[PDB]
Design a protein around this ligand. Structure first.
Ligand SMILES: Nc1nc2c(ncn2[C@@H]2O[C@H](COP(=O)(O)OP(=O)(O)O)[C@@H](O)[C@H]2O)c(=O)[nH]1
Ligand SMILES: [Mg+2]
Length: 1084
C-alpha cells in the first residue's frame, strides 16, 4: 500500500533559531507534521545520533548575522550528510536576516556559491533561502513551497535511482505493525513481547526468516522503533526512541567519573535491571556518550576541558623526536571521540600504567621518558585546514607507539569517514638540530623508500638523513624480532614456474627459507604498504597451531613469507585419494578445524568461508601432532540465514558452515560437492536444509555420534545451533571415534542372551515373554525377526559349529531343562536332546557342556548332538540342588563357578581342584563374598564376579590365594540410585584391557597390568545386560554390548575393540597440541 510518510531532519548549531523556524513553518524533539505526513526530527542539541545511528529531507539552518564563519561551520554537517545520504535533498536556510545587513547576506551568498553550491564533497545543496524572522514572511511562504515541492522532487529522484516515490507501496502488514507499535503502554519501554504481539494480530509476515527481518529493517528506517544490531541488548530489546535519547542525554549532563557513582544515580533515576545497566554502559560507549577508562571509570569525552593542559615533553633537539602531520579541511563530527576511544589501548609493551592526560582534542600518554606519546590538534595562521600532530621519541619503543597510532587513525577513517580517502600526510624533518623543520609528503618518501636511499639535500649533498628517522613506519622497523626477514635465508626467483596463485593483493610464489618450503605473497603495485600493514596487524596476535603462521615479513620487496602446506588442500584429497581418508584421519581433521574456529571466535573474528578449498593438510600420517590448518584467516556453502542477504554474520553462521564441512568429510565422495556441478539445485538445497541421509543416500558406512552432531549443528534457528566451543568439546571424545553402530530393538523386547555367528548376524533370546521365543538380528540390513520355538523361556544359546560336516546348529537351553537344537542352514531341522533333570543355566562348546541348576554338568560328544534324543558322553555332579552351575570359562583346562566354589577340569573331565572362595570374607564384606559366582575370567589370574557384588576378586590359581580386590564403587565414587555399582559382566582383552559392565549405564576400562582405571564409558543406556567379543564379517573385532534402556527399550551397541587405546592416544594428542598452543602464544 502507498505509504505517504517521510522524515524531516533539521540540523544546525546551537543558537541557530531552527526550532522557532519549524514552529512558524508548521537531543532530538520529534513531532508529526501533516501537510503528506512528515516525521520531524529536530536535532535541538548535540545529538550524536547523526553519526551514532545515521526517506528524509534535510533542513540546514544557520545564523546569517554570524556570517561566513557559520557557513564554514556547516561543512562538517554537510559532509556527514553526504557521507550517509548523498542522494537526499538539502535546503539551506539563513536566519536572522532582520538583524543582518545585506552585506552579510550577499557575502554568505557568494560564500556558498564559491564553496558549497559549486563544490564537490558536499551533497549538492538542492536549494536555499533567507529568513528575516519567525513571525512569518514571504520567504517562509516560499520556503514552505520549496520544502513541499522539493520533497516531492526527491522522491521522484528516488524513483529514478531507488525505484520508490512518496506514495511508494510497502507491504500493508508492515504498515499494520507500525500501528501496533504505536499502541504500546510500557513503564520501561523495552520490547521482547513483540513475538506475542505478532500472534495477537493473527500472524502476519509469517516468514520469520525473511519478512520479520524486513519489517524490523523498515521499522528503524521509517522511524518507528529501535533494534540495536555485537550487543546483548540488540535483537530482543526494541526500545522507545524517546527513552533511549532522553536518558542517555540526561546522564551526560547529570571530567572523569566513576562507574559506580553513575550506577548509584541511575538506580534512583530509572530502576533498570543490572543486566540492562551493563548494556546501558555499553550503549554509552557505542553512542559516544562515555568511554570506558579503567573498569571502574568513564571518560565522558563530551565536556572534557578544551584547553590543552600544559605539557612539557622530555627531548627538545630536532633529532630526538619524530613528528607526523595530517592535514584536513575540517574534522568530521565525532572524529575525536572515536579516535580517543581507539588510542586509549596503545602500549609499547604489548609485544606500569601511563600518566594519561586529556585535552578533548588530544591525548598524552606518558609511560617513561624512554617512550611516550602525544597526539593532538594544532592550527597555524593563514592555514584554514586543521590538523593532527603526533609526537614520539626516536627509539624502538617510540617507533612501536607511532605504528600503533597511525594504524588506528587510518583504520578509523576507512571505516567511518570514507570520502576523505584530503588527509594530506606530511612528515617533518631537518638536516641539523636547532633549525626549522621541512615538510615532505609521505608519497614522496615512499618513492625514496623504493630507492632505499638516504634523504639527500638536493642543494647540499653533505646533508643527508636516514629515512627511518623520518618515517620508521614506511620501513617496517616496528616488527617483532621473530619476523624480521633474513635476506640471507630467503631464496626465490619470481619465475612463472613457481607461481602458486594470485589475487588483488598481487601474487604468490613458492620459495625456500631456512631450508623449508614457504609461500611468498608479493604486494606487486596494489596500494601497497597500507595493505601490507593491515595484513601484519591481523597476522600478529593470532598464534594458534591450527592457523597458517607468518615466517617473516620484509619491506625491501614488500613480502609476507608464510608456511606452505605439504599435502595441499582438502578438496583435492577428497576427490583424489579416499584410501588416505581413513576413519582415524577423518576424525583428526575434524578436531584441528574445530580448534581454529574456537580460537578465531574467541578473538572476535568471523571466518565466513568454511569450505574444503580452505583446509590445508601438512601430512596424511594419522598420528601426527599437526595435520590440518585453516588458510587465510582474518559461495554455494552459505548458512540459509545469511543466504537471505539481509542479516549480519556471526559465529552461528560459521558453525552452520562447519556442519556442512563435517557432512562433506563424512561422505568422502564429496557427493554434495559433486552436486555443485548443478548449482541451481546445490545452493537451493543448502537453503532448504533438506539434506539426505549421508548413510542411506550415499552408501556411507555408519558413524553415529557424528551423524547426530551434524543434525544438531545444521539447525535452521541460529539460537538453537551449538557454539563452536561446544562443537569442539563434542569432537574431543574417544567414544565419538570408537562407537561404530547402534541398533535399537523393537519396543518391549527383552533379550537375555546372544550368539553371534563367527563367519553377519546375531541370534537373540527373549526374556520379555514367558514363552520360548527366539529372535534374529541381521547386522547387514538391521533386519529383525522372531518366532516361538519352545515352551518355557530360553535361558542359554550356544553355537555348534561342524565345519567338517559343513553344518552348524543353535542349541537352546531353557527353563524346562530341554535342549532344542536347530540347524542354522535349515529352520525345519529342529530336534530335542535328552531332557535335563533341572533347568539349563549355561552352555559352552569339542564338547557341548550343559550346566544345570542342580549343579550337574553334562558333557556331550561333538558330533553326537546332531541326533534327536541323544544322550551325553558323561555327567558330573559338581554342586547340588541349591548350588547351580553358572559359568564355564576356558582361556585346555576348564574353570568355572558353582555356587561359591571355583572348579576346574582336565581333558578327561576330572576335577582338578575345588577352591572355596568363601574365605575371601576376611577381606571386603561377607555378603559380597558369600554370593553365587556369575562369571570367571581366566588369564594369568582368575577374575571373579559374584551376584550383586560391587567387588571383583582376583585369585592366584597357582597358589589358590586371594591376590586383590577391585572396587567398582570407588571408581564411580571418584566420578561426580543409577550408581548401584553392581558388577554385571566381565570381558577380557589380551592387550591388558579389562571391560567391566555394571548396573547403571557405565563400562569401566581397566588396565590389567597395573589394575588402574583407563576410563569410564558412560551414559550408555539404563543398564548393561551382556557383553560379547566378536569378529565381524569384515574381520573387524568389536564389542557387542546389549543393554536395557527403560518404556522397556533395549538395544545393541557395537564398539571398536581398540577403544582402550584410542582413549589414551587421543588424550596424548590433545595434550601435546595444548602445549604447543602455549608455546606459540608465549613467544609472540
Ligand atoms: N532576530 C531574530 N532572531 C531569531 C529569529 N529566529 C530565531 N531567533 C531567535 O532564536 C531563538 C530560538 O532559538 P532555538 O531555536 O530555541 O535555539 P536552537 O534550537 O539552539 O537554535 C529565539 O530567541 C528567536 O527569537 C529571527 O528570524 N530573527
Ligand atoms: Mg531548539
Amino acid at each position: 500500500v502507498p505509504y505517504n510518510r517521510m522524515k524531516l531532519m533539521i540540523v544546525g548549531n546551537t543558537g541557530s533559531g531552527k526550532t522557532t523556524l519549524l514552529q512558524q513553518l508548521m537531543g532530538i524533539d520529534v513531532k508529526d507534521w501533516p501537510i503528506l505526513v512528515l516525521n520531524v526530527w529536530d536535532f535541538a542539541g548535540r545529538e550524536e545520533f547523526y553519526s551514532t545511528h545515521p526517506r528524509a529531507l534535510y533542513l540546514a539552518v544557520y545564523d546569517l548575522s554570524k556570517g561566513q564563519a557559520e557557513v564554514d561551520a556547516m561543512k562538517p554537517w554537510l559532509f556527514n550528510i553526504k557521507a550517509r545520504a548523498s542522494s537526499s535533498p538539502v535546503i539551506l536556510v539563513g536566519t536572522h536576516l532582520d538583524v543582518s545587513d545585506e552585506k552579510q547576506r550577499k557575502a554568505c551568498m557568494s560564500k556558498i556559491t564559491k564553496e558549497l553550491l559549486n563544490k564537490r564533497g558536499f551533497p549538492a545543496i538542492r536549494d536555499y533561502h533567507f529568513v528575516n524572522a519567525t513571525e512569518e514572511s514571504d520567504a517562509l511562504a516560499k520556503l514552505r513551497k520549496t520544502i513541499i515541492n522539493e520533497s516531492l522532487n526527491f522522491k521522484i529522484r528516488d524513483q529514478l535511482v531507488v525505484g520508490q516515490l512518496i506514495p511508494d507501496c510497502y507491504v500493508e502488514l508492515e504498515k499494520i505493525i507500525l500501528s501496533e507499535r504505536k499502541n504500546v503502554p510500557i513503564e520501561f519501554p523495552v520490547i521482547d513481547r513483540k513475538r506475542l504481539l505478532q500472534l495477537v494480530r493473527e500472524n502476519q509476515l509469517q516468514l520469520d526468516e525473511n519478512e520479520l527481518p524486513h519489517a524490523v529493517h523498515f521499522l528503524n528506517e521509517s522511524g518507528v522503533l529501535l533494534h540495536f544490531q555485537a550487543l546483548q541488548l540488540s535483537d530482543l530489546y526494541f526500545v522507545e526512541p524517546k527513552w533511549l535519547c532522553k536518558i542517555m542525554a540526561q546522564i551526560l549532563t547529570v571530567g572523569i567519573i566513576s562507574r559506580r557513582d553513575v550506577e548509584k544515580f541511575l538506580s534512583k533515576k530509572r530502576k533498570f535491571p543490572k543486566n540492562y545497566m551493563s548494556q546501558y554502559f555499553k550503549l554509552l560507549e557505542k553512542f559516544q556518550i562515555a568511554l570506558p577508562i579503567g573498569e571502574e571509570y568513564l571518560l565522558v569525552p563530551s565536556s572534557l576541558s578544551d584547553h590543552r593542559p600544559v605539557i612539557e615533553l622530555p627531548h627538545c633537539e630536532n633529532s630526538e623526536i619524530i613528528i607526523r602531520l595530517y592535514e584536513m579541511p575540517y574534522f568530521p563530527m565525532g572524529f575525536w571521540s572515536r579516535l580517543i576511544n581507539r588510542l586509549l589501548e596503545i602500549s609499547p609493551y604489548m609485544l606500569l600504567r601511563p600518566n594519561r592526560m586529556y585535552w578533548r582534542q588530544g591525548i598524552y600518554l606518558n609511560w617513561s621518558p624512554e617512550a611516550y606519546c602525544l597526539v593532538g590538534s594544532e592550527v597555524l595562521d593563514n592555514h584554514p585546514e586543521s590538523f593532527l600532530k603526533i609526537t614520539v621519541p626516536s627509539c624502538r619503543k617510540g617507533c612501536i607507539l607511532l605504528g600503533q597510532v597511525v594504524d588506528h587513525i587510518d583504520s578509523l577513517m576507512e571505516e567511518w569517514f570514507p570520502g576523505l580517502l584530503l588527509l594530506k600526510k606530511w612528515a617533518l624533518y631537518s638536516f641539523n638540530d636547532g633549525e626549522e623543520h621541512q615538510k615532505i609528503l609521505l608519497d614522496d618518501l615512499m618513492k625514496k623508500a623504493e630507492e632505499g636511499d638516504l634523504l639527500v639535500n638536493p642543494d647540499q649533498p653533505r646533508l643527508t638523513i636516514p629515512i627511518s628517522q623520518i618515517a620508521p613506519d614506511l620501513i617496517l622497523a616496528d616488527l617483532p624480532r621473530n619476523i624480521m626477514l633474513n635476506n640471507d635465508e630467503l631464496e626465490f626467483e619470481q619465475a612463472p614456474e613457481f607461481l602458486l596463485g594470485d589475487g588483488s593483493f598481487g601474487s604468490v610464489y613458492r620459495a625456500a627459507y631456512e631450508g623449508e618450503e614457504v609461500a611468498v605473497k608479493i604486494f606487486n603495485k596494489h596500494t601497497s604498504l597500507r595493505l601490507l600493514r593491515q595484513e601484519l596487524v591481523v597476522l600478529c596476535h593470532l598464534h594458534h597451531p591450527s592457523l597458517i603462521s607468518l615466517l617473516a615479513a620484509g619491506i625491501r620487496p614488500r613480502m609476507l613469507v608464510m608456511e606452505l602446506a605439504s599435502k595441499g588442500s582438502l578438496d583435492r584429497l577428497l576427490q583424489q585419494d579416499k584410501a588416505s581418508l581413513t576413519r582415524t584421519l577423518q576424525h583428526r581433521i575434524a578436531l584441528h578445524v574445530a580448534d581454529g574456529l574456537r580460537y578465531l571466535h574467541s578473538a572476535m573474528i568471523i571466518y565466513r568461508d568454511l569450505k574444503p578449498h580452505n583446509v590445508l593438510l601438512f601430512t596424511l600420517y594419522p598420528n601426527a601432532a599437526i595435520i590440518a590448518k585453516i588458510a587465510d584467516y582474518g559461495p554455494g556453502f552459505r548458512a540459509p540465514e545469511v543466504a537471505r542477504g539481509n542479516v549480519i554474520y556471526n559465529q552461528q553462521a560459521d558453525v552452520y558452515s562447519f556442519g556442512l564441512l563435517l557432512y562433506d568429510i563424512l561422505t568422502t565422495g564429496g557427493r554434495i560437492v559433486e552436486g555443485l556441478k548443478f548449482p541451481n539445485e546445490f545452493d537451493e538445497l543448502e537453503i532448504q536444509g533438506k539434506l539426505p541421509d549421508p548413510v542411506k543416500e550415499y552408501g556411507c558406512a555408519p558413524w553415529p555420534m557424528v551423524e547426530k552432531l551434524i543434525k544438531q549443528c545444521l539447525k535452521e534457528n541460529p539460537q538453537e545451533r551449538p557454539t563452536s566451543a561446544q562443537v569442539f568439546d563434542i569432537l574431543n571424545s574417544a567414544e565419538l571415534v570408537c562407537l561404530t553402530r547402534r541398533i535399537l530393538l523393537p519396543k518391549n523386547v527383552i533379550v537375555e542372551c546372544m550368539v553371534a555367528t563367527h563367519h553377519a548376524s546375531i541370534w537373540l533370546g527373549c526374556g520379555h515373554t514367558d514363552r520360548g521365543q527366539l529372535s534374529f538380528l541381521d547386522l547387514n540390513t538391521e533386519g529383525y525377526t522372531s518366532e516361538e520355538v519352545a515352551d518355557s523361556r530360553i535361558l542359554c544359546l550356544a553355537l555348534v559349529h561342524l565345519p567338517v560336516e559343513k553344518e552348524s546348529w543353535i542349541v537352546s537351553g531353557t527353563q524346562s531343562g530341554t535342549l532344542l537344537v536347530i540347524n542354522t542352514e535349515d529352520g525345519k531341522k529342529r530336534h530335542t536332546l535328552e531332557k535335563m533333570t533341572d533347568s539349563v543355566t549355561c552352555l559352552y562348546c569339542n564338547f557341548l557342556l550343559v550346566g544345570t541348576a542342580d549343579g550337574k554338568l553334562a558333557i556331550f560328544e561333538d558330533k553326537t548332538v546332531k541326533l534327536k534324543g541323544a544322550a551325553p558322553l558323561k555327567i558330573l555332579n559338581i554342586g547340588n540342588v541349591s548350588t547351580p552351575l553358572m559359568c564355564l570359562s576356558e582361556s585346555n583346562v576348564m574353570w568355572g563357578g558353582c555356587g561359591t566354589k571355583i572348579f576346574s577340569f582336565s581333558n578327561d573331565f576330572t576335577i582338578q581342584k575345588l577352591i572355596e572362595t568363601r574365605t575371601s570374607q576376611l577381606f571386603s564384606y561377607a555378603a559380597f563374598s558369600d554370593s553365587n559366582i556369575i562369571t570367571v575370567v581366566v588369564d594369568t589370574a582368575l577374575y571373579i564376579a559374584k551376584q550383586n557384588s560391587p567387588v571383583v576378586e582376583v585369585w592366584d590359581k597357582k597358589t589358590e590365594k586371594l591376590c586383590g580386590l577391585i572396587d567398582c564403587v570407588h571408581f564411580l565414587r571418584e566420578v561426580m540410585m543409577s550408581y548401584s555399582g553392581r558388577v554385571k559382566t566381565l570381558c577380557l582383552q589380551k592387550n591388558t584391557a579389562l571391560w567391566i559392565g555394571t548396573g547403571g549405564g557405565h563400562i569401566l576400562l581397566l588396565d590389567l597390568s597395573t589394575r588402574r582405571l583407563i576410563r569410564v564409558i558412560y551414559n550408555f543406556c539404563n543398564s548393561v545386560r551382556v557383553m560379547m567379543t566378536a569378529q565381524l564379517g569384515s574381520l573387524k573385532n568389536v564389542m557387542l554390548v546389549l543393554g536395557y534402556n527403560r518404556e522397556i527399550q533395549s538395544c545393541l551397541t557395537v564398539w571398536d575393540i581398540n577403544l582402550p587405546h584410542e582413549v589414551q592416544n587421543l588424550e596424548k594428542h590433545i595434550e601435546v597440541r595444548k602445549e604447543l598452543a602455549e608455546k606459540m602464544r608465549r613467544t609472540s
